[PDB]
């Protein structure tokens, strides 16, 4: 819909910021096994832009639809890794402590319209997210 | 796959993508946000939409 | 104590209150519980100590003892605090 | 036209940053009174994505034309609030103390173009913002 999300649940009552990388080969990651990869330690680094929203304890991390990746989650409690095969994704927290990580699946609704309202009652129409 | 939740609290839910809020006093504003359901797996809670209930003659 | 200030459309207005009742809790002198306060406390009116009062140095602070060592016939000497002499 | 743009003048001789970000239902903009919302505290805190210019004393805050909106402004010195019945937007300054700050109402002329230029004259003509 409006991108690729990744959510990032925390420890902070606050709003920690998140900052977005991506690589291809960084070690461990080589698909012929430990440095097989054509630059030891990993390729081009980009900075990944992020649009980042707050929730208690959780953090929406809005990507362009365009990075869209399936892959693992690895949880280091610094940064949490989204790893598909050779490509990963890194997401560096500060100020708090990574308690779990995951691409949003179950998505919340969008076009709340209200309807048919009267003294005693309303109608109350969405669209899946 | 829905649940509806008036001025922050659940008052129930649906399958379908619309939903009748019932029993509200007359001339007063709420607010209502919506989450979908997937197997106890809810998701977070939707932008508040706010309305006003009409006052009677 | 440094409260941080609750203004109306802050950003983190839960999270402020709880911290600010969280610091006044901690630092606060209670009507229960065993403590240990610091700082100079002058207290205006009366008090009372029902239970163990404990005193450090009870002796020199509020009892003194002149006396003449070359003669023993005239004690002359400046009062320490206002007293009542033996 | 460009976009949306907040004023925030400043007591720095330099460039202060600023942090935006946006939430309904904060303590103190309920509809129905202190608690009458839907998530105590605030909704869902969105960072705003901003495009900063600066001259002496006077940061420019250029949003999307998207999020623009009407309101009183709160000087706190720290931070400056739009604040719009429920909706906040919330500007941080960092290295400074704000002065004034106002969504910017008379905007600076455009398409400025010389013509008719001789030697000893020219023509300026320019758009309104």
Same mark, same amino acid.
């Given at each position: 819909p409006s991108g690729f999300n990744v959510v990032i649940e925390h420890d902070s009552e606050y709003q920690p910021d998140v900052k977005v990388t991506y690589y291809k080969?960084?070690? *461990? #990651?080589?698909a012929n096994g430990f440095? #097989? *990869?054509?630059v030891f330690g990993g390729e081009r680094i980009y900075n990944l832009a992020s649009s980042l929203s707050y929730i208690r304890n959780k953090i929406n991390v809005e990507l362009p639809s365009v990075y869209a990746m399936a892959g693992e989650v690895v949880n280091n409690g610094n940064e949490l890794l989204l790893i598909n095969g050779t490509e990963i994704m890194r997401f560096v927290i500060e100020g708090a402590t990574i308690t779990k990580g995951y691409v949003e699946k179950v998505k919340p609704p969008t076009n709340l319209i209200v309807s048919d309202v009267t003294s005693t009652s309303a109608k109350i129409s969405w669209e899946n997210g | 796959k829905y649940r509806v939740y008036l001025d922050g609290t659940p008052v129930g839910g649906s399958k379908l993508l619309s939903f009748d809020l019932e029993n509200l006093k007359a001339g007063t504003s709420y607010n209502v946000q919506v989450s979908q359901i997937n197997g106890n797996v809810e998701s977070d809670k939707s932008e508040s939409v706010a309305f006003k209930t009409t006052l009677p003659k | 104590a440094e409260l941080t200030k609750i203004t109306r459309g802050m950003q983190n207005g839960a999270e402020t209150i709880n911290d600010n009742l969280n610091k006044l809790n901690t630092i606060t002198v209670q009507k229960t519980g065993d403590e240990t306060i610091a700082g100079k406390k002058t207290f205006s009116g009366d008090v009372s100590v029902d239970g163990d009062f404990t005193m450090k140095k009870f002796a020199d602070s509020y009892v003194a003892f002149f006396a003449n060592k +070359?003669? +023993?016939?005239t004690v002359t000497f400046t009062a320490p605090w206002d007293c009542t002499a033996e």
């Open positions: 080969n960084s070690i *461990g #990651t080589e440095d #097989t *990869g054509p | - | +070359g003669s +023993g016939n």
